[PDB]
Ligand binder design. Structure first.
Ligand SMILES: [Cl-]
Ligand SMILES: [Cl-]
Ligand code: NA
Ligand code: NA
Length: 325
DNA sequence: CGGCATACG
DNA sequence: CGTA
DNA sequence: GCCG
């Protein structure tokens, strides 16, 4: 089992679901405490289990696996022996974890803001509502729409949304295309947001596109909230006899950069962090959603496809369905 | 020990 | 600071 | 927390 998540296929569903979920609780809790190193380790150990071809039933199966040291191994050991890990359960029922999870789930609220509110004694969404002077307009929208945004988006919803985005994009710039990215491109049947990448086949025609797209969607009454080339919005999505708020991200890239933007925005988040870490540390190349830079030659690799990018990094190609690290 | 992805709004 |  |  190779050390980086980008070196192994990771399917969306797998054979170690409970073990990985437990490790991810500890990762999440480390993040709430600002411990990014520990968050990464627990994320990586969880991902290794997702990549295994069968269930871990015995502690000896962890031998030789990367990212399993004393701590992650003890978590697995306790789950195998008793069905539960005392540390994980202590985190789950803790006021700190529950409140930081609740607050960071709000659109517009990150760990730092959540922690500040926690320290001020705030605990519930109604606590935040009672103090609107404490909120940015983005947070106010996140809080008003929190219930809808907590509901899973279905792939059927995604397809209806794509047609609407395509219509606006087509008027903004005929010939421009819309590609579904994010978790849905990785095969998810449900999700909490929808990501689209927009380009045009004629290099440079994409300049200034996103404001034209957003103005048109706003004119159609589809935008509940928006605040350039990336837009993090809340859209009005039809439902039987009503509608609901959905998080939608829109990103524009020049066609020259499209494979890099597609790769970046397809995720998963851990997959992309691992891939960029691999590129820099193992290959000495610097990867982002715009390109892949050789800092010695001072040149950019001109990729025509995601397959090109994997080849240039010396990695076996993984389709989006196997990037669920 | 140092390092942990890398951008844009 | 937030977002991915 | 773990790797190199
Ligand atoms: Cl840490
Ligand atoms: Cl980027
Ligand atoms: Na080990
Ligand atoms: Na948030």
């Amino acid at each position: 089992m190779p050390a980086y998540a980008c070196q192994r296929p990771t399917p969306l569903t797998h054979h170690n679901t409970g073990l990985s979920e437990a490790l991810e609780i500890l990762a999440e809790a480390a993040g709430f405490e600002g411990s990014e190193g520990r968050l990464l380790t627990f994320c990586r150990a969880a991902s290794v289990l997702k990549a295994l071809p069968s269930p871990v039933t015995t502690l000896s199966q962890l031998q030789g696996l990367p990212h399993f040291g004393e701590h992650s191994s003890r978590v697995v050991q306790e789950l195998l022996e008793h069905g539960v890990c005392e540390e994980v359960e202590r985190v789950r029922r803790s006021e700190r974890y529950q409140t930081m999870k609740l607050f960071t789930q709000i659109f517009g609220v990150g760990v730092k803001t959540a922690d500040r509110w926690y320290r001020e004694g705030l605990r519930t969404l109604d606590d935040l509502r009672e103090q609107p002077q404490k909120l940015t307009q983005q947070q106010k929208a996140g809080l008003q729409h929190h219930q809808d945004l907590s509901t899973p988006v279905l792939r059927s919803d995604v397809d209806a949304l794509q047609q609407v985005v395509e219509e606006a994009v087509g008027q903004a710039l005929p010939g421009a295309t819309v590609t579904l990215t994010g978790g849905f491109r990785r095969g998810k049947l449900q999700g909490h947001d929808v990501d689209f990448l927009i380009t045009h086949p004629k290099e440079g025609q994409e300049a200034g596109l996103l404001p034209r797209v957003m103005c048109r969607l706003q004119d159609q009454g589809l935008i509940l909230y928006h605040q350039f080339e990336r837009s993090f919005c809340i859209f009005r999505l039809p439902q039987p006899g009503s509608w609901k708020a959905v998080r939608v991200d829109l990103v524009v890239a020049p066609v020259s950069q499209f494979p890099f933007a597609l790769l970046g925005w397809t995720g998963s988040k851990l997959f992309q962090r691992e891939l960029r870490r691999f590129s820099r540390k193992e290959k000495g190349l610097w990867l982002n959603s715009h390109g892949l830079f050789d800092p010695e030659q001072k040149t950019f690799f001109q990729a025509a496809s995601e397959e090109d990018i994997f080849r240039h990094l010396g990695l076996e190609y993984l389709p989006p369905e196997q990037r669920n690290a």
